[PDB]
């Protein structure tokens, strides 16, 4: 078959563990044709690792979208998007396209811009095939605030699904539990808990981007949403376990570890 | 051991077949840790496919370099660079790093009748990049420019160009003959200052080759990083790109990219090697 065309709308992580770098690397690992519409460029100070986010002008953002839409993506992912304007356009781009899958990683950084959260709820959730919040982001999107348990994650997932997302996976992460990694997946009918072990020498920069990018490529290549999130969780678990130390401040996931090194078991249960 | 850290200094090809996209994809296929310092963004009109090159401001270029250099590349590739200033910086970044390998893809545009679009850029490459290069990877046109010989038409002309490019300081030179040299076979000429080798594969379909050059240079870089000799890196890189070209696909009426992952996923192609 021809390679599936998979677009990410995301920024450049110059360190190359997260951002569009994670997305293109993951798309490559999963035998898709990766494409990116760049939103911003993120750099890091050599001594302190302080981040500098340089937005790209809207005119060049729009030129890239014209090109990507002409090529015709089969699936679109959104990464961290910085403005309500870009959030709104990302949704519009997916609706204009013939893409069948839209995966939204609702990256946020009390939230820094609650305006962006409101924009995600308005413009992206109603279009999303899968939305992939971490525990914090899920509390923001659902309006519940802080989530502390699987039962709280069930409530938030219901609310997010009701806002229009077709499938919701909330990543518990270290915020939920420091010995096991628990995610709550909801399809409108059934709550599934997905669990992987955690490992001592792991590194996690780019994990969220990688998970969402793998989900997108798995969907594009024909996995059901359930199968895609379960396979994506195994994919990123391997990446995290095999992450490596970049400097005193960070270490990226190994995007290629699933294929090159090992698979990690994912336990699936109904909750 | 640890993944080798491989940096490209290149622009974004929004169509994703060439540019930094080809570089990161190839880096990933070859089990390295790919990185980019972005110079520019190239977009295309939906109707005519006319290109628009949007330079990135020099301050953001510099911020990316600082981050990349802090991380510490094991190898650096240069793709198409738009100005003498960025050509010069690229060479400086390599000197400042602890990278042992520098692969320069000396991308130029021919204006017709063997004339180059930006002659200052060719002078800047000869001045700042050739003397630093582990490998330089010109096509036939570029090699005529870098050597000052103009149009090359034979292996004998290519040998002459290679010796001149070597004398300008490149450690290893590979001149890609392409369709300009022969329509049935893809002949490249490799030189290491001592021996000339002709590398051959079949000339595959010509329709869907977008990103071939970038891919070849990126693969060379990755193979070096991962410990292949320069001769084995270029032979391996030739095989790698040959499968990519053979398995290219039609994107639209104007372009078709190489399949960067074809070597690993689809098939392996033999490279004939002969001393000449």
């Amino acid at each position: 078959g021809a390679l599936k065309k998979v677009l990410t709308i995301a920024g450049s992580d110059t360190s190359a563990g997260a951002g569009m770098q994670a997305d293109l690397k993951t798309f490559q690992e999963l035998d898709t044709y990766g494409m990116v519409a760049l939103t911003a460029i993120v750099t890091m100070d050599k001594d302190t690792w302080s981040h500098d986010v340089t937005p790209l002008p809207m005119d060049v953002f729009e030129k890239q979208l014209e090109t990507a839409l002409s090529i015709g993506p089969d699936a679109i992912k959104t990464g961290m998007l910085g403005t309500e304007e870009i959030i709104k356009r990302a949704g519009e781009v997916y609706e204009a396209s013939n893409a069948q899958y839209f995966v939204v990683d609702p990256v946020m950084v009390e939230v820094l811009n609650p305006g962006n959260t409101e924009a995600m709820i308005k413009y992206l959730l109603p279009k999303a095939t899968v939305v992939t919040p971490n525990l914090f982001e899920a509390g923001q999107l659902s309006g519940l605030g802080k989530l502390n348990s699987i039962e709280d994650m069930k409530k938030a997932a219901t609310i997010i699904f009701d806002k229009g997302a077709q499938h919701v996976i909330i990543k518990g992460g270290k915020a939920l539990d420091q010995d096991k990694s628990y995610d709550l997946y909801y399809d409108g009918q059934t709550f599934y808990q997905l669990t992987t072990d955690m490992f001592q020498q792991s590194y996690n920069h780019g994990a969220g981007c990688t998970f969402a990018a793998a989900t997108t490529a798995y969907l594009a290549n024909g996995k059901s949403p359930k199968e895609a999130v379960i396979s994506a969780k195994a994919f990123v678990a391997s990446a995290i376990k095999n992450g490596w130390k970049m400097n005193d401040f960070v270490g990226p996931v190994d995007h290629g570890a699933y294929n090159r090194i090992e698979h990690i078991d994912v336990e699936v249960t109904e909750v």
Side-chain angles (χ1 to χ4, degrees), chain A residues 1-109 111-199 202-271:
Chain A
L3 297 169
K4 300 292 189 299
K5 294 165 281 169
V6 183
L7 175 70
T8 186
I9 306 173
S12 180
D13 167 10
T14 307
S15 74
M20 63 94 175
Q21 285 84 341
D23 295 338
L24 296 176
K25 293 170 178 194
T26 300
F27 296 159
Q28 197 65 29
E29 285 297 324
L30 294 174
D31 298 314
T32 65
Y33 185 77
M35 306 173 52
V36 47
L38 296 163
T39 57
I41 293 174
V42 188
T43 60
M44 295 89 177
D45 181 279
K46 64 178 180 181
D47 292 308
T48 71
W49 223 245
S50 183
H51 292 30
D52 191 354
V53 177
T54 297
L56 291 171
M58 289 302 298
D59 45 21
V60 78
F61 181 60
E62 290 297 340
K63 288 169 185 184
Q64 289 176 87
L65 294 178
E66 172 177 327
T67 299
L69 185 74
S70 182
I71 289 162
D74 298 299
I76 304 180
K77 182 215 166 195
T78 66
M80 189 285 170
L81 303 175
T83 69
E84 303 182 5
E85 293 80 10
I86 285 166
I87 292 170
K88 190 175 191 282
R89 288 293 298 120
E92 290 176 340
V93 156
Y94 171 64
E95 287 215 316
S97 81
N98 292 323
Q100 299 172 288
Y101 311 104
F102 191 39
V103 173
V104 173
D105 193 20
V107 181
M108 301 170 191
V109 184
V111 66
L112 277 171
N113 195 13
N116 288 353
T117 297
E118 202 28 58
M120 297 188 218
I121 296 157
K122 276 169 53 154
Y123 302 119
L124 298 181
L125 291 191
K127 299 183 182 63
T129 314
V130 185
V131 64
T132 62
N134 64 18
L135 196 67
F136 174 74
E137 295 150 2
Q140 298 306 113
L141 290 171
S142 62
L144 301 180
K146 208 161 182 301
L147 311 175
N148 293 306
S149 61
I150 291 289
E151 280 298 316
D152 280 349
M153 295 158 83
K154 287 167 69 180
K155 297 181 79 275
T158 293
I159 292 160
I160 299 166
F161 175 93
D162 289 346
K163 256 67 160 296
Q166 296 163 220
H167 301 265
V168 184
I169 187 167
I170 300 169
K171 303 167 285 180
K174 288 179 190 190
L176 183 67
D177 194 278
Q178 301 81 66
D179 287 286
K180 273 192 165 48
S181 169
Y182 303 93
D183 303 333
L184 190 283
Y185 171 56
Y186 179 54
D187 65 358
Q189 279 186 327
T190 308
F191 301 99
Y192 295 94
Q193 178 177 279
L194 313 193
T195 334
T196 55
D197 280 5
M198 298 179 129
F199 306 89
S202 69
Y203 288 87
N204 281 269
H205 180 69
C209 290
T210 301
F211 174 75
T215 299
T216 311
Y218 283 128
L219 286 170
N221 284 339
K223 284 184 188 297
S224 69
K226 183 174 167 198
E227 291 166 328
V229 303
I230 289 166
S231 290
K233 180 69 172 317
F235 185 100
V236 74
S238 182
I240 292 163
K241 176 180 187 295
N242 289 290
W244 56 276
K245 183 181 184 177
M246 174 174 279
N247 55 36
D248 296 323
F249 307 103
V250 70
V253 303
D254 184 348
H255 319 79
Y258 182 85
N259 287 336
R260 175 177 13 91
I261 305 177
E262 68 197 325
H263 297 188
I264 294 303
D265 190 87
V266 174
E267 300 202 318
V268 182
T269 61
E270 303 183 22
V271 294

